[PDB]
Amino acid sequence: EGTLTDHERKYLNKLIKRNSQNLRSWDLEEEVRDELEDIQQSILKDTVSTANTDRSKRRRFKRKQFKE
Amino acid sequence: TQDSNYVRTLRQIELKKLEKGAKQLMFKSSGNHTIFVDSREKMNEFTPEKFFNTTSEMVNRSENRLTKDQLAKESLDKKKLKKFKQVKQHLQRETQLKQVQQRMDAQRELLKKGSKKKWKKQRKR
Amino acid sequence: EDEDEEEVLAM
Amino acid sequence: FPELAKLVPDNYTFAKLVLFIKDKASLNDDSLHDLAALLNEDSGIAQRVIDNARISMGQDISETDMENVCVFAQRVASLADYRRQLYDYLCEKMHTVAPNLSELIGEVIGARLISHAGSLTNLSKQAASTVQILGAEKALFRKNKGRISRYLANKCSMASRIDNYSEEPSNVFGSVL
Amino acid sequence: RAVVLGGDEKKARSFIQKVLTISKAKDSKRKEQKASQ
Amino acid sequence: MNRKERKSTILETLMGDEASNKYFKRKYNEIQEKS
Amino acid sequence: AANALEEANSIIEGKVSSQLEKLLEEIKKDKKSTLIVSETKLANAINKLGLNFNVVSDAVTLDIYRAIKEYLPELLPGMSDNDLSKMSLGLAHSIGRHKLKFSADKVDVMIIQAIALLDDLDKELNTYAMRCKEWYGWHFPELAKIVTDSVAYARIILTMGIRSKASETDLSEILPEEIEERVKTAAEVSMGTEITQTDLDNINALAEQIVEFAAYREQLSNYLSARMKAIAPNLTQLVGELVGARLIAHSGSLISLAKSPASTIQILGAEKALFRALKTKHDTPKYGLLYHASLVGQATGKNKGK
Amino acid sequence: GARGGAKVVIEPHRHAGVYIARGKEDLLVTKNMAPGESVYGEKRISVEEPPTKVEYRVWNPFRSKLAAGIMGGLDELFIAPGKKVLYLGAASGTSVSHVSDVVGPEGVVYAVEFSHRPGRELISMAKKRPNIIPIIEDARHPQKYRMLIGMVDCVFADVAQPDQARIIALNSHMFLKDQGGVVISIKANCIDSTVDAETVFAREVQKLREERIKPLEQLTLEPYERDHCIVVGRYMRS
RNA sequence: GCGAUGAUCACCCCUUCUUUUUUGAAGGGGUGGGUACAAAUGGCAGUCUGACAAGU
């Protein structure tokens, strides 16, 4: 009902800190994400490929254009 | 020391092994997110905290940006890093096995009975 | 026969 | 008719009902009474099977497929009847052969103990300690709980001796035992 | 010949090689003693 | 033998024995320094 | 549901059904009444009937139908929302089967289950046969060596229950002449012991299960043959029913087998030898499961591989 | 990755009916409506709960575009427990099964497919899931299957056709409720491969606006897909 | 109102006040393991080669 008091608004705010603090443990450290991200890109780039897809767009774009 | 059949079988094992590992890994999203706003004054006052109804920490987490109302290990993370490398290791072996297989196929192809002028254009009867 | 064989591409 | 498999979980009941409701399309009030007679309407399955049969996603199977279901369901029904017949035979035979052991623990349990020993003569030759571990893998005789198990194993050993080494064993000693 | 082995295969092969070395050492030691006598 | 302890090969059961592996690891080492 | 499917199909095609025609006729008494129809196609079809109705189908009527479908469960007393969902679910599957040209005689999943069931029956019938031989072998242990067939063995028990009966009982329909006299000689000189009628009755009951199961096993074999000649008639003509059914079961579906190259079909049932040979630099198999095809049997020597 | 024997901690996602399985890696996860089986071979995470054994299925972003949307961080997903959903372009149960999991027993999913061969696979999966109503019909003529579909809360369209905007509008005009949900998967190449994907995405947003659908947010699906985006809009009849 | 026809014998969930004062008051569940059966489109696990062959 939006009857939140100053004291009530403090207890809930503490819960936000408490829950968010706990989820940081599952979030992991920033340093590992630096290496993990680099590994993720290397795995993704080879598996997804799409280098030909990037080239195909350029070829189709170049073909349609008038050349003088 | 090995034949073409042996190398082919190993590469196929890695390829299926790679798919199961890659499927089971999780990769963070990198796509662009855009929001459509009715009015310019609504645009200027927009902030990620209000739109998502989340705290600043959750805004950065696109995958699980929990609503604030809802809110109201070095060994462990190392095993994660080994694990992402382990998929990389399969990726490295697969290309290495592919290179060996390609060379084996070329040698057999050369041994094949042909004009081999580079092959001369000749219909095979 | 283990002596005959040699292991490669190890992780 | 996938729904009906849920409506009658009992395996024996389901087969008999399948014999009657071969095709779920056939639904009559008289047929409802007939299947209502099968088992009881207290569970309410009789009205459910009519309602579900009218609205279900089951794909109709060919007559030959249906002929195999009922025929196979008949084969299951025969075995269940024969199993009940054989069970009675085992109970009667145990009383004749091992009245003391059967009376002490039971016909089925006594028969399992005899088979584990390999024969009634083998069971009688064993010591009470060996008899106890003979049925310790299926918990045939099962700190105060263990004492009863050991006590019952000793009495079971004696009961087997009276049965094996008697030309016409009686149940008099098994009863007091 | 060059071959590619999994983890379990490698453990079995390592275990055998350990055993043969122990057996070779033990057999030689007995030989030297009886040779000395 | 318990079902989990049973293995298809005699070698695989032997590896399971913790006492055996400790002796092999110790005994394997001493031969190596001597070598 | 059969009526519902026919009625639904007419609606999809835009045709007026007899029930709808009968339903509209009942209201025919009201002169000059306007008919609102969701589809233009159905509206035109109703117009052709010559009924005294001005049929209207326009975009504005869509707002009307939206409200009705939103509140249809309340509009129709006596029917709950859940029951409408179930009737829609059952009808949808019926329509989907019709659209997909589903036929009860062209489902492979019966083949995969029948062949799996056929092997299960062979195993179980074998175990019951062994029990009968051991249990009845107590009475007359020499029969098993004489007659090896389980079905023939069980029939001898049914015809004659006790060795005494062997003198008068005739085994001509079960056994040849030379075998039937052998059992008669064995009966009198047997080492077995007598059994009671109570023991005999249950052994007869067990034997009756042997012949019934053998009878049904033949039925399942014929049933699978009928299935194979309707679901894959061309394959059966070439490889046969039994090997053809086994091929489908190994892949798990007819489509899964269809997408396989002919090389894989050659060695489909010899994966253990295939992958052992590939990893050890040794020659590979060349028949697999097709070795039991009739044509391969007719071949000899190296021609079997070809 | 998380091998068969690995242990994970399951915690709820921001969207109702979606879960995250914590451990060595997070995993996007949904509760299994039909436990004990997988529909396309996905790994299943199973947990004891008082003891009844509840099961969960892994949701692969690379196979499902809706899953890729959740990964990108979509603000709002109208697909939620106890809601009717109309799924257009249901090639098979790869993504419809997961949508069927999210809605739960109370909700229903209307899966629409045109091609016969994917359709038979869809029917086979639907038998396991009672809440899925398969419709083997062309989405370009929604009047054909109007009977089988009631009013729906949300519409999800994965149809890969150049004229998908027309298909979305026709289906929404008949079945989608006022203020309802609209989630569209757009592939730039199928519509117009000549021009950049950004131009196509802007072009589609305009067509939705003409059809009384108010766009709320747009999201590209990289790295899961290239030249794809998910557009989330609300159906404003008034 | 006993007994040789048999007694006995894995893990976790001093401080405050006060006193005629050396006196009074207060602070069953989950893990793990063993036996038998059933299911998994769960793992090992990867589906051989590819243009010549045969006759005068």
DSSP state string for G140-197: -TTHHHH---HHHHHHHHHH-SSGGGGGT---TTTS-HHHHHHHHHHHHT-------H
Chain G interface mutation, best of B5, B12, B13, B104, highest count of G Cβ atoms under 10 Å: B5
What is the rounded distance in angstroms from the CA atom of residue G253 to the CA atom of residue G231?
11
The radius of gyration of chain G from alpha carbons, rounded to an integer in Å, stands at: 34
Closest by Cα among D143, D142, D120 to D133: D142
For residue H136, list its beta bridge partners.
Answer: H113
Distance set, CA B84 to CA A36, B63, B88, D25, G178 (Å):
7, 19, 6, 57, 75
Asked if H1 reaches chain B (Cβ–Cβ under 8 Å), the answer is: yes
Both tokens of residue H184?
Answer: 């569209």
Distance set, CA H124 to CA H5, H131, H134 (Å):
30, 13, 10
D32: exposed, middle or buried (Cβ count in 10 Å: 0-12, 13-18, 19+): middle
What is the rounded distance in angstroms from the CA atom of residue D110 to the CA atom of residue D101?
6
Which H or E run contains G54? strand G53-56
DSSP string, E1-37: -EE---HHHHHHHHHHHHHHHHHHHHHHHHHHHHHH-
**Encoded amino acid at H143, one letter:** Q
Both tokens of residue B98?
Answer: 């592919």
Chains B and A are touching, with contact defined as 3 or more CB–CB pairs separated by less than 8 Å:
yes
What is the rounded distance in angstroms from the CA atom of residue B13 to the CA atom of residue G133?
49
Closest by Cα among A43, H68, H2, H67 to B29: H68
DSSP string, G96-139: HHHHTT--TTS-THHHHHHHHHHHHHHHHHHHHHHHHHHHHHTT
Distance set, CA G22 to CA G39, G49, G136 (Å):
19, 12, 72
Alpha carbon A12 to chain centroid, angstroms? 28
Closest by Cα among G305, G303, G299 to G285: G305
Ramachandran assignment for B33, one of left (phi > 0), alpha (psi -120 to 50 degrees), beta (any other): beta
Before H12, cis peptide (omega within 30)?
no
Q: Which residues does chain G have within 8 Å of residue H147's beta carbon, measured at their own beta carbons?
A: 8, 11, 88, 91
Instruction: Map residue B29 onto helix, strand or coil.
Output: coil
Closest by Cα among D175, D173, D152 to D164: D173
Q: Which residues does chain G have within 8 Å of residue D78's beta carbon, measured at their own beta carbons?
A: 209, 212
H157: exposed, middle or buried (Cβ count in 10 Å: 0-12, 13-18, 19+): buried
What is the rounded distance in angstroms from the CA atom of residue D92 to the CA atom of residue D110?
12
Both tokens of residue G200?
Answer: 């005999």
Tell me if G192 sits within 8 A of G140, measured CB to CB: yes
What is the rounded distance in angstroms from the CA atom of residue G154 to the CA atom of residue G76?
65
Distance, Å, G127 CA → I2 C1': 52
Both tokens of residue B109?
Answer: 């192809």
Sole residue written with tokens 């049929």: G55
What is the rounded distance in angstroms from the CA atom of residue E13 to the CA atom of residue E11?
5
Nearest to H25 among B31, B64, B80 (CB): B80
Chain G interface mutation, best of B6, B97, B101, highest count of G Cβ atoms under 10 Å: B6
Tell me if H157 sits within 8 A of H168, measured CB to CB: yes
End-to-end CA distance of chain B: 35
∠ CA G42-G44-G47, rounded to 5°: 110
**Encoded amino acid at H78, one letter:** F
∠ CA H54-H57-H62, rounded to 5°: 165
| Bases along strand I below 7 A from a protein CB | 5-9, 30-31, 33-36, 39-52
What is the rounded distance in angstroms from the CA atom of residue A44 to the CA atom of residue A21?
31
What is the rounded distance in angstroms from the CA atom of residue G126 to the CA atom of residue G120?
10
End-to-end CA distance of chain C: 22
Both tokens of residue B45?
Answer: 């006052």
End-to-end CA distance of chain A: 72
β H152-157/H85-88 pair status: parallel
Q: List all residues 6 or more positions away from G253 whose beta carbon is below 8 Å from its beta carbon.
A: G108, G112
What is the rounded distance in angstroms from the CA atom of residue G290 to the CA atom of residue G267?
8
Closest by Cα among H145, H99, H101, D47 to G91: H145
What is the rounded distance in angstroms from the CA atom of residue G82 to the CA atom of residue G69?
14
Tell me if G119 sits within 8 A of G236, measured CB to CB: no
Half-sphere exposure of residue G204, counting CA atoms within 13 Å on the CB side? 12
- Other CB atoms within 10 Å distance of the CB of residue G162: 15
What is the rounded distance in angstroms from the CA atom of residue D127 to the CA atom of residue D125?
7
Question: DSSP class of residue G301?
Answer: G
Question: DSSP class of residue A28?
Answer: -
Q: Which nucleotide is nearest to D151 if distance is taken from CA to C1'?
A: I6
Tell me if B125 sits within 8 A of B115, measured CB to CB: no
The radius of gyration of chain D from alpha carbons, rounded to an integer in Å, stands at: 25
Tell me if H213 sits within 8 A of H238, measured CB to CB: no
What is the rounded distance in angstroms from the CA atom of residue G153 to the CA atom of residue G99?
53
Tell me if G204 sits within 8 A of G165, measured CB to CB: no
Both tokens of residue D116?
Answer: 């584990």
Q: Which residues does chain B have within 8 Å of residue C11's beta carbon, measured at their own beta carbons?
A: 86, 89, 93
Question: DSSP class of residue H145?
Answer: G
Q: Where are the beta strands (DSSP E) in chain H?
A: 9-12, 19-22, 28-31, 44-49, 52-58, 85-88, 109-113, 132-136, 152-157, 176-187, 213-220, 228-235
Instruction: Map residue H88 onto helix, strand or coil.
Output: strand
CB contact under 8 Å between C11 and B93, yes or no, is yes
For residue B34, list its beta bridge partners.
Answer: H218
Chain E interface mutation, best of F22, F28, F33, highest count of E Cβ atoms under 10 Å: F28
- Other CB atoms within 10 Å distance of the CB of residue D113: 24
β H85-88/H52-58 pair status: unpaired
What is the rounded distance in angstroms from the CA atom of residue H142 to the CA atom of residue D162?
85
Ramachandran assignment for B123, one of left (phi > 0), alpha (psi -120 to 50 degrees), beta (any other): beta
- Other CB atoms within 10 Å distance of the CB of residue B42: 9
Distance set, CA E15 to CA C5, E22, H93 (Å):
16, 11, 48
Solving technique: cryo-EM
Which H or E run contains G34? strand G33-36
CB contact under 8 Å between A60 and H193, yes or no, is yes
Breaks (C-N over 2.5 A) in chain B follow: 72, 117
CB contact under 8 Å between A43 and B71, yes or no, is no
Distance, Å, H161 CA → I33 C1': 59
What is the rounded distance in angstroms from the CA atom of residue B18 to the CA atom of residue B93?
10
Chains G and H are touching, with contact defined as 3 or more CB–CB pairs separated by less than 8 Å:
yes
Q: List all residues 6 or more positions away from G103 whose beta carbon is below 8 Å from its beta carbon.
A: none
End-to-end CA distance of chain H: 50
What is the rounded distance in angstroms from the CA atom of residue B48 to the CA atom of residue B60?
10
Closest by Cα among D162, D170, D120, D96 to G199: D96
Q: List all residues 6 or more positions away from E35 whose beta carbon is below 8 Å from its beta carbon.
A: none
Q: Which nucleotide is nearest to D139 if distance is taken from CA to C1'?
A: I35
Instruction: Map residue G248 onto helix, strand or coil.
Output: helix
Cβ-based interface (< 8 Å): residues of B facing G: 2-3, 5-6, 8-9
Asked if B89 reaches chain C (Cβ–Cβ under 8 Å), the answer is: yes
Both tokens of residue G86?
Answer: 């179930």
Both tokens of residue B88?
Answer: 């990389």
Q: Is the dihedral of CA H141, H143, H147, H150 positive or negative?
A: positive
Question: DSSP class of residue H107?
Answer: S
What is the rounded distance in angstroms from the CA atom of residue D122 to the CA atom of residue D164?
9
Q: Which nucleotide is nearest to G252 if distance is taken from CA to C1'?
A: I41
∠ CA G118-G119-G123, rounded to 5°: 120
Tell me if H134 sits within 8 A of G96, measured CB to CB: yes
Instruction: Map residue G55 onto helix, strand or coil.
Output: strand
Both tokens of residue B93?
Answer: 């072996």
Half-sphere exposure of residue D115, counting CA atoms within 13 Å on the CB side? 10
What is the rounded distance in angstroms from the CA atom of residue E10 to the CA atom of residue D51?
63
What is the rounded distance in angstroms from the CA atom of residue D76 to the CA atom of residue D70?
10
Q: List all residues 6 or more positions away from B21 whose beta carbon is below 8 Å from its beta carbon.
A: B86, B87, B90, H1
Q: List all residues 6 or more positions away from H210 whose beta carbon is below 8 Å from its beta carbon.
A: none
Tell me if H192 sits within 8 A of H222, measured CB to CB: no
Question: DSSP class of residue D27?
Answer: -
What is the rounded distance in angstroms from the CA atom of residue H81 to the CA atom of residue H152?
13
Q: Where are the beta strands (DSSP E) in F1-35?
A: none
Tell me if H135 sits within 8 A of H110, measured CB to CB: yes
Both tokens of residue D18?
Answer: 């399948």
Widest pairwise Cα distance in chain C: 22
Q: Which residues does chain H have within 8 Å of residue D57's beta carbon, measured at their own beta carbons?
A: 126-127
Distance set, CA H106 to CA D51, G68, H12, H157 (Å):
20, 22, 19, 22
Output D109-115 pairs: Cβ under 8 A, ≥24 positions apart.
Answer: D109/D140, D112/D138, D112/D140, D113/D140, D113/D156, D113/D160, D114/D160
For residue H109, list its beta bridge partners.
Answer: H85, H132
What is the rounded distance in angstroms from the CA atom of residue B64 to the CA atom of residue B67?
9
Distance set, CA D156 to CA D118, D150, G126 (Å):
16, 10, 36
What is the rounded distance in angstroms from the CA atom of residue E15 to the CA atom of residue F10?
12
Q: Which residues does chain E have within 8 Å of residue C7's beta carbon, measured at their own beta carbons?
A: 2-5, 10, 13
Closest by Cα among H181, H182, H185 to H224: H185
Both tokens of residue H163?
Answer: 């004229």
